[model samples]
Target chain A: LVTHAFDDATALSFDGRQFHGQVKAEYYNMVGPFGGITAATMLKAAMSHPERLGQPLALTVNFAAPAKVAPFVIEAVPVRTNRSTQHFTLTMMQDGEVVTTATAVFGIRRESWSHTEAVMPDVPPPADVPRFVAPAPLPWMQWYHVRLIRGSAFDEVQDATTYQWMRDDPPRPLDHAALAALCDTFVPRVYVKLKRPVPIGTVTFTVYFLADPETIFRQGTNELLGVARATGFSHGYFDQIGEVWSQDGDLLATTTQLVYMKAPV
Target chain B: VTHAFDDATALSFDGRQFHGQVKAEYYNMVGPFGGITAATMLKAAMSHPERLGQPLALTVNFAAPAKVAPFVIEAVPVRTNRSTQHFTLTMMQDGEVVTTATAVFGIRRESWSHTEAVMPDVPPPADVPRFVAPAPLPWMQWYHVRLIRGSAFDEVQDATTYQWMRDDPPRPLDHAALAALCDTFVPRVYVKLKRPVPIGTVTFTVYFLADPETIFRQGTNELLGVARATGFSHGYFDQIGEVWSQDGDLLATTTQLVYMKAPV
Candidate 1:
């Protein structure tokens, strides 16, 4: 709780107090409420404990009040109370204002699984190239940056449509939310440079993580890679595809995102 | 130039120096090579002026060594050098990492004429009911959607879906709703359904808008919905359905996402 705080804002536990928030602008904007910071903060809290959850993948978050700073509390409880899935409603509060609310699904681990035999496209390994972080200012000061570690082994950051790699140190352990955290990270970079930003917001994000945790973990830090691409951007919206890879070039996970953009300020 | 750390044990960046710890634990993980979090975290920095040069949406990952506290960092750049920022990467140094990882940074933005396509056409979702349809796991939570006709409507209909969304709300302008509502409906629902659904040839799309006219119903408890999927390709394979919704005024839609059930 005290560990994941940026200045005064922190990702507290349910016991942190009374958490509550309501949806505000863009009633249907749908990219998610409170943007990413607030939601992710609470996410850090929920993921610490997962065996206690039900629907692991499906979720929707409603942001009310840009979630400025709130002097409130948050609590995650079961929604469906079903065996197949469980929804956790997380509320945010700032004094009297409802900052944000989210419904997250959790499911029990299962041994039975089936899906498409899709494979990842070939890309260069992260270990093969010189690296350097490009701390360039956000062109329009818009969020999302690209820190190119000079001499990086990344041969396809702008190619194949998407970028891929693991993180230096994620706050939480491996779980569904952790899986989502990984999938969620790829949306912004899929096409900001490829096409103009005409107001982008996520409409949907579908991800499938390969179940073999051992195979995934074995690929090593140099193994994780992402293959992202823009599928379509029509009618004020855009879509992106991502394929995650291990150092061995084994495909680990894949996902799709839907976004809407307002001209950059 | 003097903000953010590289999680490299101990280094500073005046934009001049690199900060962050470097450990041996980063070796066991997967894809720890570039600044993947650069897009979101860096954006967080840019969005808020107080933190200028301070990475926003900055993805700070935790990588701990054996018996030693973990190392962390927040810095990764994207491609689009203009109004919009987009790119990806992981981090790897210290020979190899043995712990966790993350990718955080800001999303670059771009400016352009404001033009939005009209929402796709589908029947009003009110005509459809929440009957014994395909219910995958506990999908009922999170999004409360009502199913309706599709380009694949009619029992005679083949592949497609039109789902109506009823968000629990103060009618907040939520971007997450757009993604949450659209995420894996056609796919999950497609799987749980005991009936026949095309598993391949799918592309999902969604329109970003707030017009209730196209969304169906808002500020109310009960909402109408619909979906239309079509079987366009392989026979023993799949048919992808395009999904979208109208809120009496605005619109949101989704492309047909591929579903893998049988051998194509």
Candidate 2:
């Protein structure tokens, strides 16, 4: 059996309430490991814990400080466990200093009245759209096969909106951790709207899982369509809203993140 | 002139923790309004002397329902950077964790700006009639609400609502007030099932796009709200809503995960 880089990157060793993992160089960004991978690792810590109850329903990860390309410790505490739902508070530390903090909600899904109000945006098939080839690739960008339909950072646009199709380069099966990483795939909205690179980093990221594990797993190795846009940008901060949908039009997850940006003089 | 909202959300801080009370005027079906609880949490951090900037994002997790008595909030600035700051807040009663939250505060600087999400086109607040629930919730009395579409238990094909609202006494807009209004939308599950069921918000998040100057410009005017659900599965549903100023500016966007129990 071949080992996937994603699995290797998110793999962790647990001892009681703490889990130990290292930042993979393959997912490195300008400053540290990609924020997406950090988020996935955070979720992995909770899902791997023996005390974890149910599956992921929602997660919020705050990037307090960037992590170095070395071993990091994650403390996953099951703060409260109800009859059907559980809550967790997780922290990532390097050399006894806090680098990241996160909170997660897990619940056992039961049959209930269901409905979908946000319609999937109509877009061309992934096969029809040309694959996006970054002129200057970042280490993390190479791991995913991306096809841009609109709102490319290269092209100046009036508003920040991106529609793309993406999947792991090796085509791994879709899972909760993979979906969480995919949510952070879009470049910062400021970069896309301004058409110029600026100093930016995500401060807080939140994801709401809309599909169960079974539903998510069914989309194995398939390219998922993603659409992202910004609501408002002001005072050196902005928020990005995104949705990832299965090929069959299933809304897999909805995510939002607050980013810090510095305008170029 | 004293405002009811001020009296309801009053908190006493001793530099380390904040002490607050649940007012009868903001009581809901089970506990005090979740919005008020959230606002109070945000207030705790905002009231901190060490706070550096305005709220950029807030996430409140309802671990357990708070009682109708006094509670203590401990807001800690875990990480403080030059331009950005992160806080972890906890609300406790009788030494048990009832609510927990994490917030991001940052200094605002001039930067490239835009709003891609457009506000819904609806009738002016004067054209819409006030909404009066058949089974009144006591907290509803604290706000002046007018429904533009998708009333409670309407059995509509989809769960979407547009309404106009402001404090009953017409208090000016602020981050805390905006935080409370974000939770005012009738739980999306109620609109989907067309009946009131046992439900409570588990995790709620808000992203503030506008700064204090923009938010305060609304003064006593009403803010338009639009809410809808993307999916309701298993035992939970997600409600996404937008709060827009009367002038069509998107002030804040909010979302939440709620626990619901519906009949078979």
Candidate 3:
């Protein structure tokens, strides 16, 4: 199997302490790279660190400004480290300007009273579904092999809801960074809501990993079912909640974003 | 209308640093209510001279236990843009870092909009009557809460809960109080199980959906609260909630991941 484009593109080079990264043009949206890749890139820095305690439990990334295509530096500072959990403050700097700031909590998880209150939507397996190929104009779409399960496949749609099976093409092993990228792979929920793509920017994104690292790595490039729905859209902003579940039905990650959506152009 | 809860969270700024002391009325099963601690952190940023715009998003990480002694808050502006600013705040007690937060502030502008989330069906706060916790949970006395349905002490039901809450003595509404109000609900898991367990919120996020004018319109009236748990597993669970003005304005959307201890 070939290495996933997402992995190749967001891969970072570490110097035992900090990370060096550059944006790939393919992942570019209206601004810099897709926020998902940026989110994943931030997670990669922590995951690569030798001192990281455990898997990421929660991460909040605030895009401070537009990240230029030039190379940038990621400094992941382990602010507080406990026996079972570690907290980090990560920042992306480009040309001496802080473009992004993130905080992550990583913890060693163990078995406990477990239950999934939000049931996974019943849908056809990825092999049985038809692929959703958005037009080539949207560059971020090329990185994913998507089989639409609900909402607009760029067709007639009324309410904003999207359910689909997705995995990185060229097949790569799953990890925290990869799962973080998939957490954001869904296009703007407003796009599915309005049935068309519009200018949208996610100002803040917070992802909580509900599954342990072992459960996630076991998926091994298999397509995960992703579901997203917007709770509200008002006065130029809307927020959407998304869930990524393993094909085996494990809830891997739950993410939400508060986005700035411009008027239809 | 004396603003007891608001006054309880009131902080003092001495140019570079912000200082606050924990009040006993807001104490949770431990220390003080997490919501009030979150508010105090936001207050540090809002009280900063370099701060810009209202709070669009806030995330607080509880690193260590914050005790009842006096604490210092430091809010540093990491980045400032044309219309937005990013600030990080830390609460230090006796030279130990207890809470850390990052907040995004931005000005609001007119644009296309809609509210897709519907307010949960429940009785008005006036009709629901007030709910007082047992004398042991001292935190409950700081606020006047009335439950329409879904109370852990009452009975076991589904994970969703709807309640009405406001500052006990009533205070003028502002971003600080509203931010704290978003986290006022008990752990939804407890509400679902109809029992109490030891749980602490690790990371809490609040996205402000309305402007101050919209929230202030409610004045001293209670704000409607709707919360539900998504999943519980491996010692952690998450809850998502919406806070609305009594007049149907959606003021904020919030989410928190709680670290739960195993049962006895």
Question: DockQ of each candidate's interface versus the true one?
Answer: 0.04, 0.65, 0.62
- Isolated chain B TM-score per model: 0.42, 0.96, 0.94
Cand. 2 Cα-lDDT: 0.87
Which DockQ value does candidate 3 get? 0.62
lDDT of each: 0.36, 0.87, 0.83
By DockQ, who's the top model here?
A: 2
* Per-residue C-alpha lDDT of model 3 across residues A33-127, encoded as one tens digit per residue: 78888999888888788788778899999899878888999999887888788888899999998989899998987787877778888889988
**Per-prediction TM-score:** 0.44, 0.95, 0.95
User: Candidate 3, which segments miss by more than 4 Å at Cα?
Assistant: A1-3
lDDT of 2 by residue, A78-193 (tens): 87889888888888999987889999998888776666778899899997999999888999998898998889778766778999999988789989999999998897888788
In candidate 2, the residue pairs with backbone N, CA or C atoms under 3 Å apart (3 or more residues apart, or in different chains) clash, namely none
Worst 10 contiguous positions by lDDT, candidate 2 chain B: B149-158
**Model 2 docking category:** medium
- DockQ head-to-head 1 vs 3, winner: 3
Where does model 3 sit among the CAPRI classes? medium
Deviation in Å, model 3, residue B136 alpha carbon: 4.5
Order of models, best lDDT first: 2, 3, 1
